[PDB]
Structure formats: C-alpha cells, structure tokens
Amino acid sequence: MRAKWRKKRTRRLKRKRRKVRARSK
Amino acid sequence: GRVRTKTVKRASKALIERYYPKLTLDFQTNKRLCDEIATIQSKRLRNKIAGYTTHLMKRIQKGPVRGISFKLQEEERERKDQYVPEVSALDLSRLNVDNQTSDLVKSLGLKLPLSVINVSA
Amino acid sequence: MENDKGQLVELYVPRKCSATNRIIKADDHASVQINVAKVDEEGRAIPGEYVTYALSGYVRSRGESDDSLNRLAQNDGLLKNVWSYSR
Amino acid sequence: GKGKPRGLNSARKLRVHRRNNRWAENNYKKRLLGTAFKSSPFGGSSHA
Amino acid sequence: TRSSVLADALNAINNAEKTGKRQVLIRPSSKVIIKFLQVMQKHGYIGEFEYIDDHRSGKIVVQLNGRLNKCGVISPRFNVKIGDIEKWTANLLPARQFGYVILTTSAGIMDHEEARRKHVSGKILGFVY
Amino acid sequence: GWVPVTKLGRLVKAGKITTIEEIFLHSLPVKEFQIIDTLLPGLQDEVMNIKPVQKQTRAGQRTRFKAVVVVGDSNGHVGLGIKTAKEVAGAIRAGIIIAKLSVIPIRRGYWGTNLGQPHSLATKTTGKCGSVTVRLIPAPRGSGIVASPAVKKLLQLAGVEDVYTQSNGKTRTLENTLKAAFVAIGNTYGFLTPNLWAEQPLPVSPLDIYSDEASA
Amino acid sequence: SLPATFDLTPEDAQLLLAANTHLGARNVQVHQEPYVFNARPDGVHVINVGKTWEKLVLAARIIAAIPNPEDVVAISSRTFGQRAVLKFAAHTGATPIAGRFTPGSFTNYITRSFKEPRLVIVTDPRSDAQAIKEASYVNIPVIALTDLDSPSEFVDVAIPCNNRGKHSIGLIWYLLAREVLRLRGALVDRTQPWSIMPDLYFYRDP
Amino acid sequence: PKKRASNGRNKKGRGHVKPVRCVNCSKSIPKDKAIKRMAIRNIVEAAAVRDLSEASVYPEYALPKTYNKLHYCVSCAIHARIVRVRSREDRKNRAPP
RNA sequence: GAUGAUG
C-alpha cells in the first residue's frame, strides 16, 4: 500500500500496544 | 486522383532532354513520335507518357522548369553567364572612407585619394 | 628504440605535431600536413619543393590551427607582420 | 580531496571508521556475534 | 584554504600541458617549487623558467614543451626507507627505464636514482614522467 | 578480381606502396579491405563468440546474430570488428572484413635490459569501453600472457609474449572487454617515451609523390 | 621569404577598400582578434587589409603546391559566392561544388559525387559546415574566407574578409585566381594587371 | 529521470514563491509555475460594432477594452488547449508562437 | 470535463 498510509497504520497500532501494556504498570 | 507515377514522370523527362526540337504541343503529334523514339509496352502507358511530355512543353514556354535542362536552354544560360559590365562598379567614379579607415592607410604606407567623412552610433 | 647491439627494433617512428609536439597516431583522421610552395627568383613556384608543416587533430579541433600556422610561417619567413608574440 | 582523512597523523580515525563499517558485512557480523553457537541447531558442528 | 603550494603549481603545469599551451604562470612561488622545477628541467621536461619579484611571495612563468606527460605530488609526504623506494617507483612509474620519483632528503631535493648513487633517503614528494 | 576505387588502393595495387608502415606513418584512411590483405598476407582470424539479438514487432520477435572477430599477424598487427546479420555465416564473413580495415600497430619494448628482441609492452596502458577498463603492465620473461581466455587471444595475435593484465567493471559483457583491450593495446603508440624526443624531417606523402599513378 | 614585388600595391588597396572587404562584424571572437585594426563608432570593426593580402598570397602558395589542379575543390553553398566559385574552377583547374553539398561526398566511396581532394576552399564556415566536418574524417586541409565572428574550428588558413557583401566575396575569389595563375606562370608578369574584370565574379539575380 | 532542468518552474535563487489560485478549478499553484496569459478584447464583439455605432449618441466614440490576466494550473492548461504536450527536442524552445 | 467493475 501507499507508504504514507502504511506509516499511519503502524502509528495507530503502536498507540494501542502502548496502552494495553500500561495496564500492567 | 490523377497523380502520375515515377515511371511516367521520368520517361517523359528523358524524352524532353533528348528531343526538344522535335516535340510539339500537339498530343496527336507527340503520340506518334513516341512510337518511333521509344519502346513502350502498352497503348495506355504510351498515352500517359506522351500526355505528360506535352504538359511539360507548355511549362517551358512560360519559362524554365526546375530540374529539366536541354541543349538549347543551357547554351543561352552560359551566354548570360559571360556578361561583364561596361566599367567595373569598383572603379573610382569620382573613394570615401572613415577616420579609422584613413588611419589604416597611413599605417600600411600606401598613397591613395582618400576623402574622409564622419560617422556616429 | 634499439637492442643491446645498436639495431632498431621499432616498427616505425611516428611524426609529431609542429604546434604542440605530440604524436600523430595511425588513426588521427583530423590530422593534416600542409605543403607551402617555395618561390624562385622570378616569382613562380619551384615544383616539388615545399616548406612542410603538421598539425594534430586536437589542435585543429580546438580552433587554434589558424593561429599556430601564423606563428610557424612567420618563423620560416613566409609571413611578415601577421603574428605578434605579445598578445 | 576524497572523503577520508589523509594526514600523516590520521591513523586513529581510519582505524575506528573501518571498525564501525565492518558490521555491514554478514560474515563479520555473524562470526563475532557468535550466532553459530547461540542459535544454530548444529551449534557450529559439521555433523550431528 | 591553500594547504600546499607545490600541489597547485604542479596542477597548473599539468592542465596547460594537456591543452597544448607553451607556457604557464604559477603563483605563489617557493623554495621547494624552484628545486622541484630544477630536477624536471635537468631531465628535459620543462625548459626555461623565470621568477618575478613582487614583495609578496612572488610568481613564476614556466616554458613548456610537449615532453611532459604527468607531474604531481604525493600527499602526505610519507617516510621512505632505502628499501622502500623500489615499491614506489613500481607503483607510480610507467616503465622502469624512464621516469623519476622526486624525494626530499638530507642531501637535498633529489630524484630516486640519484638517491641510490648517494645512498640517502627521506620523504617522498612527487613524480615526473 | 578487384578494381580499385580509392586513390590509395590504386597505388597499392600498382605496387608503389610496399609496406603497411607507410600507411600508418601518414595516417591514411583505409577503405577497401583488399589493401590490407595485399600487405599483411599472414593475418589469421579467430571468431570470439556469436550471440542472438532481438527486436519486438507486431508479429513477434525479429532475431539476428552478432559476431565478434579478431584478425592478427602475431607480429605486431591486430584488428577487431563486429557485425550483425540475419545469417550467422554472413555475420562472420562481414566481420572479417570490418576487422581488417581497423588494423593498428603495436609497440613492444622491454621489462628490463634491452637484451635480444622485444617481448612485452613498453609502458603501462589503459583502455575503457562501457564500464570495462583493461590495464596492461610489462612483465618479465616467462610470465606469458596472464589474462583471461578472451583477452589472451587478442594479445597473442598482436605479438605480445609476456604481459600482466588487470580489469575492472562488468567483464562478462565480452564485447566491451575486447573493445577495451583494443584501445589499451593501440594506445601504446601514443605514449611519448624519451627515446622518441629527437626531431625528424616530415616525409612527403606517397599520395603526393606518385600523383600521376593515383589519379589513374 | 618572398621578393618585394609580392607586397600590397596601391592599385589593389583601392579594390579592397572599394568593395568593402574591411567592414567587418560588430562582434569579434577571440581567435580572430589579431586580424582587427580598430573600432569605428556604431560598432563596426575595420579589418587590417594588410593581413588580408598576406594571408591571400600564403593561401595561394598552398594551392600551387598541389600536383594536379583538379584535386582542389571550391565550395560555396550560399548564393553570393556561387558564381565566383564556378569561375575560380574555370580559370584554374579546380572542381567546383556550387549549390547543395551531398553528405558523403568525401567519406562514401560508392556515391556518384565521390571526391578525394588534397585541399578544400570554402566561402563561409558557418553555412558550409558539412564540407568542413567531412574533411576532418579523411585528412583534407581547409582554407576558408572568414569574418571576425565566423567559426574557425577545423579551418587551417583563414583569409579575413567581409563576407556579408556581394562585391567582397567576389573580389577575394578573383584575387586567389589571379595570384595562383601568376605563381604557375600562366600570367607572365606580376606588374601588369589581369585582363578580366573582377565583376565577372559578382552575383546577378534579375 | 529528470525531465527538465527548470524543474517545471521558474525558481532560481529563491526559497519560496507565494501561491496563486487557478481561474477554473481554484487549485493552488506557485506563481512562478502557473501558466499566465493576458487577455484583451473590445467590450463589444465584432458582429455588434456596427449596430453600436449607429446607436451611439456621441459621434466618433472610441471603443473601450477589457483587460484581465488569467492563471492556469497545468491540468487545466492542457485541457483548455492553452499548452500542449511537446516533443523532447521541441520542449526546450521558449519563444511564443 | 455525465456513466464504464472484473478475468
């Protein structure tokens, strides 16, 4: 897919890994 | 369309450059000449060849046609190329020169009948 | 180029450009060689007698051929006041 | 000049620079990391 | 900035020799420049040259002939042992019958075959062939 | 038969040019392949490789064949030529002719002391075509031609006995490697070694001293 | 060295000044700078006619060295020099090329126009560029009538003259013919002028 | 590859050039890149000049004119047939028609 | 300067 939108997807995915992992802190 | 092929254009050209004095504007006369001056394989092609030869003949009456030349024409040409006026246009009918042109004559050391006229931008 | 006992072992010794002193190779097809007729006392050429010059392809291509012939000719007496050293 | 030091006293920079770039090579990277013993199923042996 | 004056001088000679010129102007001058040009001259590669005084490190004009093929410096001026000269000529000379490597020594600026006669060595400077 | 068309061919046929060294010395253009085989009768030819080439069209691939040919005396004369034609045989046949028109002289000198006859090149030389650059360095006696099979053949046919070689670039495109070697080997006569520094009178061209026979 | 009779005579100087062979171009290129004399107001640059003459005799002496007169080829693609060229060849023995110059006359040896001369003379290096270019592939020397702005690459003996005028081009061709014949002896005496008016070389287009 | 040495615009020795809006689609394009034409016409078309002269109260009245400068983006300049695709050798030409 | 996906 387009490079820009692939970059976006990885960002909206990291933002979610970043908060699910915050549940164990 | 009534365009004529290279076979017709060149066979007609090849006859004028050899037979101008004998060719005429008449189609019927030219048609009979081309029986004794060429070997052609058909009445149709012979009629076309003679027709375009006639066509060029009218053109030559009006003036020189490009790319076709024959004895009578060139002989007149070379006579017009031997022209030489009564007196050279370079002769000193009266020579005018600029100030810098005069300075050149002095540097070379030549004596001439200079007349000096000014100039500006 | 000789061997140990004075024998030339070279196919041929090439010419050299008069203006720049480089070798005129076997396939320098811009290269030329000018022949300038000597003139006898009466003022008419002496056949077969020449003042010869060579110019390489490089010199001619750059546009220096005309100028460098003026210099060589004057140094050989074939011109009087065409070339000036102090450009 | 080309993009490297050339002075008589530039030996230090030319050593360090080459050391850093050797890691782009695969053979150098695998050998010094020791991935043969760490991960390879044969563990560096020719037969098992 | 202007790091080597000998590098500029030998580059100007090279550039003009390849474009058919018969003379050059090299600025600025220096003692090593004169001595370098004296070894070249001795071996027939330049011809006459002249030094202009201007109270400001001066200029030179070098007549040229077609003889020269290349001239240049080796930078940095490496140290050369007396057994290492044979590995420098082998690298930067066309064939081992002609060509010179010019190297500065205690005896002075010289060429390599003179350095063998006199049994000296020092720092390498450049080459001419 | 052969009926000359150029001026030089007329003198050559008449026998008023004897050695191919005169043509090289005056750098005359050679445009008839009979001038070369009437002065170098010992040339032998070796065909390097034949490769197919193709161009697309409406109705598929048009295919032709490309040949490389090297002709040489093994005593200081070589030539290289390339031609494409619809038949492999015609490509080779025309390849020999183009090869002949491009014969150049070689210079041979010594590695060391000038003992006996020349065996190697006089000086280092480099040649480039496309990416491929080939370099030739003099070698002692007994080294032989240290080169790959294709470049080795062309050096054998020029008469070099011992020579080192080094190469850079995409060598597998053999047309460029052979054409780069050809430049390197022909450059040997453009290098102004100091034994040529002497001044010689310029000779008068054969095309001028035999003017009568040239015109007819 | 040439004797003293080859120097420029005042009679000739009148011709050269009368046809304006000295009124050159407003812009001068570096290679032609030696041939300039001085700058008139309005930008015109006067040419040193002394060097025009000296270069004309020198060129004439190269032509006279060719063993066979037919191997001198004269070209003039532009009109103001076509009549002149056809007459240079007549009086001397040169082969004229007036009009279109077919590419491959000098390099293609199976064309009907094939010529392999030992010298070529051209009227304008900017408009006869094909002949100069093709000369460089087969080692043919070149002589060219050159203005102060015309290109000089692959030209050997340039004769500086004003090439924007009818009478100037005609006169230069006429004087090359005269000098060449005197050298070869076809004209006995250098002191007495030629019996053919120079206007025989000038263009006519009624 | 690089299709043009001018990068399709007239910008050398500057960082930025302010934008302008196209006269058809309103799309923004730097001034130095826009295709610009100066249109001038009589206020009365050619067919109507005669009838307006008859109606004119004043004798010998000079016709006014309309002036406007029009900016086109590349897409709308191609479509309106204001500029056209041009061959490689012909692209370098700068002169008007 | 209306619409027109796929093998």
Added chain:
RNA sequence: AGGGGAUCGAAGAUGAUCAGAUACCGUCGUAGUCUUAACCAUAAACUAUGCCGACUAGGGAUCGGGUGGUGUUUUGACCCACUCGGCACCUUACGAGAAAUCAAAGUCUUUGGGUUCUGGGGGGAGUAUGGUCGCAAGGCUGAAACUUAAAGGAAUUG
C-alpha cells in the same frame, strides 16, 4: 492559556451520482485559519548534488559598486568600452558518465590539495526492546529470529 473569530474549512450534517458511494460534485458547518505568552522539532526542509582552495573552452543578456568617455537628450536618466562580486542562461566535447545528462557530476587504474558526514542485495524494519527528550501527539538512538533470487537505475523496439 487569554484575545479575535470576516472568509475558507480535517470532523459532523445534508442533496445528487451509482450495483454500493460511509468518495469525487452542490449547500451548511465545529476545531483550525489570524494575534500574545509558552511548547513542538518535523517535510519531495530538493539543486534529491556538503564546506574551504587552485586550474581548464567559446557567446551574449541582467542586478549592485567603481573607472574612463567634459559621449547625447533634460547632478540625475540613458549610450560605448572596461573591471570586481552575484542570480542565471545559449553553443561544444579537450574531459566525465551505465545512460539520462554535466563548466562541474572535469583536472580519478597516468588512481594522493585540506577536511567532515553517510552506504554495503531485496524483505522483516525505521518494527520489538532499553535508554533519553516532550503535557500529549511523538522526536533522536535502534536490533534479532526468520524468509528470499532476484528487488532497482538509464535507455531501446513493440
């Protein structure tokens, strides 16, 4: 976080088109757009071309300063020549390049003027992990397992 808030307008709401149209097109419209204080630190941030220095070809136009021409119209404005420093441009191939092309991307197998930064087949991946900076969005630093015979650059005929 205050002030301002006319136009245009991520979101949102609606009419049309369509097999669908949570899109392109038409009409509204919040945040924003503007300003003050304080953060952010990114871009096809491009000339996809690091900086200082010397040298090598032709032609003209223009911007700023200076010299000569008591040039010519009425100190200034123009005009001709010359010069230093700029933004560029036209022609050419000594030269360079795989080519497109380039007065530098030249003076590099005839390889060395000084110096800094970056790259090592395509993917996984600018991802995980640990530091560090930020209010947050995120920025800088940045792997491995594993998979793979080709991805790619410039030109050529269809």
